[PDB]
Motif scaffolding. Sequence first.
Motif, short mmCIF file in Angstrom:
data_model
loop_
_atom_site.label_atom_id
_atom_site.label_comp_id
_atom_site.label_asym_id
_atom_site.label_seq_id
_atom_site.Cartn_x
_atom_site.Cartn_y
_atom_site.Cartn_z
N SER A 106 8.64 83.67 120.18
CA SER A 106 9.01 84.81 121.07
C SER A 106 8.62 84.56 122.51
CB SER A 106 8.13 86.13 120.70
OG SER A 106 6.85 86.03 120.73
N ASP A 107 9.34 85.20 123.40
CA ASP A 107 8.95 84.96 124.93
C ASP A 107 9.02 86.29 125.66
OD1 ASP A 107 9.02 82.96 127.40
OD2 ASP A 107 10.72 84.10 127.82
N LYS A 108 7.93 86.53 126.51
CA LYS A 108 7.75 87.91 126.97
C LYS A 108 8.02 89.01 126.36
CE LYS A 108 10.46 86.24 130.28
NZ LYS A 108 11.53 86.91 131.28
N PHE A 109 7.45 89.03 124.85
CA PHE A 109 7.74 90.16 124.04
C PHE A 109 6.28 90.70 123.60
CE2 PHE A 109 8.02 91.29 119.16
CZ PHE A 109 8.69 92.55 119.33
N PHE A 110 5.33 89.99 123.20
CA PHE A 110 3.97 90.41 122.90
C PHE A 110 3.29 90.61 124.16
CE2 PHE A 110 5.13 88.44 118.82
CZ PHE A 110 4.96 89.55 117.91
N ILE A 111 2.41 91.82 124.19
CA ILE A 111 1.68 92.09 125.47
C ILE A 111 0.31 92.09 125.06
CG2 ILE A 111 1.55 94.16 126.94
CD1 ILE A 111 4.20 95.11 125.90
N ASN A 112 -0.45 91.24 126.10
CA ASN A 112 -1.93 91.10 126.09
C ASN A 112 -2.58 92.52 126.11
OD1 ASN A 112 -4.08 89.30 126.03
ND2 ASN A 112 -4.10 89.17 128.40
N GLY A 113 -3.41 92.70 125.20
CA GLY A 113 -4.23 93.80 125.11
C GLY A 113 -3.34 95.14 124.60
N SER A 114 -2.44 95.07 124.16
CA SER A 114 -1.56 96.34 123.47
C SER A 114 -2.01 96.68 122.36
CB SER A 114 -0.14 95.75 123.26
OG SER A 114 0.19 94.84 122.46
N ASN A 115 -2.63 95.48 121.47
CA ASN A 115 -3.37 95.71 120.23
C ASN A 115 -2.53 96.03 118.99
OD1 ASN A 115 -5.83 95.55 118.82
ND2 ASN A 115 -6.18 97.84 118.75
N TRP A 116 -1.23 95.69 119.26
CA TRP A 116 -0.23 95.65 118.23
C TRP A 116 0.47 94.49 117.77
CZ3 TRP A 116 4.73 94.69 120.14
CH2 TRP A 116 5.12 95.25 121.37
N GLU A 117 0.78 94.21 116.65
CA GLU A 117 1.33 93.00 116.04
C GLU A 117 2.85 92.84 115.73
OE1 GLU A 117 -1.86 93.66 114.42
OE2 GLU A 117 -2.90 93.08 116.30
N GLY A 118 3.42 93.96 115.78
CA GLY A 118 4.75 94.06 115.31
C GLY A 118 5.36 95.46 115.90
N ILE A 119 6.69 95.65 115.51
CA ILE A 119 7.35 96.95 115.58
C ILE A 119 8.36 97.43 114.54
CG2 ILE A 119 9.37 97.95 117.21
CD1 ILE A 119 8.90 96.05 119.16
N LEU A 120 7.62 99.00 114.33
CA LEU A 120 8.48 99.50 113.40
C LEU A 120 9.46 100.59 113.94
CD1 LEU A 120 8.72 100.58 110.48
CD2 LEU A 120 7.10 102.61 111.11
N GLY A 121 10.87 99.88 113.70
CA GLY A 121 12.02 100.48 114.32
C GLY A 121 12.46 101.65 113.23
N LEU A 122 12.29 102.99 113.86
CA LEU A 122 12.56 104.13 113.13
C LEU A 122 13.99 104.58 113.46
CD1 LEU A 122 9.00 105.71 113.57
CD2 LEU A 122 10.12 104.99 111.40
#
Length: 372
Positions: A106-122
Amino acid sequence: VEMVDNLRGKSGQGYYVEMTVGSPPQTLNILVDTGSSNFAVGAAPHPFLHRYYQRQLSSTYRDLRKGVYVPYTQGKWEGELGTDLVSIPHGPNVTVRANIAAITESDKFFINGSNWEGILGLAYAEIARPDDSLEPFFDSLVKQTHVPNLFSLQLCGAGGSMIIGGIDHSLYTGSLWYTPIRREWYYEVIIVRVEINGQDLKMDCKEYNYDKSIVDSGTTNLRLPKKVFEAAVKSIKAASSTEKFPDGFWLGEQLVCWQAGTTPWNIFPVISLYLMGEVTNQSFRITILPQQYLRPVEDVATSQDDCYKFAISQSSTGTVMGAVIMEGFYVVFDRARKRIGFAVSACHVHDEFRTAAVEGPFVTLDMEDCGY
Ligand SMILES: C[C@]1(c2cccc(-c3cccc(Cl)c3)c2)N=C(N)CCO1
């Protein structure tokens, strides 16, 4: 009640839910996103990941032998598709098998301190990557369990709740007003009128929905098409005239700061978004206070003050009713009835003079179709 307060986060970095993937279960924090349709999780180390999905440790993992590449405007990820057992510890008491895009680069996707590791696309299969044949999580959950085809979100400023399969009456007051889902891809809706401090923008309503209008928990701001954005900035600047801010502030690039507790909320106008009702030419409005569109930016270094980012920005992909808009409302994603419900939530924005609201009905006999 066991699903109440199952979300964490904030509008700026996203709201997340705890989920488990694999056997034995691997706990991960997952961004709740009504603006996308893939269930995608960090599956390799990264400087911004606390943890990641370790497929070799899951005996129930099945590799689908198909890669997926997902570019966005400001970032991208590559991964491998597979299926595995998924559960939401503070959600329905069920375990389902679901598609999982294991993110390997990945590139510029994960955010430092967001505390999340994935996405649940609803959102719906139509916008799934690589294509519409990759069943989204929610469709699998509905197919495999007796869970009703509906979820609701109560996003709260300063966590919140994601209720799957029903409507929790203790999370809202007053009436629930429904707007139709125009097309099943994104949660597409129609805005029929826009007012800023009771003043109509007067544009042809198709402009409010150029080229689509969506309800997106995975976008921070209220994003508006160029023509509408410029009119909104003109109106807000005019109401807030006692104070003059740099163009950087209006561009959403720079902070505006006031001494702690002194934010002049009264100089900023309310925004009313009238949504298409369930009956011809009837609508309802949702009212957005400056406590929603002025996003607080927490920073110990600036903490003698209260600082904010202007959370309304220009879009070339249509209107986005992002998390700042959803905050303070109970938003019902009624997939079964192809409609989205809004009601004032327990965590609604208010001060001594003004309150966020959901009001209706409004009638417009002299109306065209507001869709593009
Ligand atoms: C997939 C994502 C996405 C991807 C990565 C991060 C986010 C994100 C980042 C910060 C805040 C929020 Cl709410 C979401 C969203 N979801 C959207 N609805 C629009 C942008 O694309």
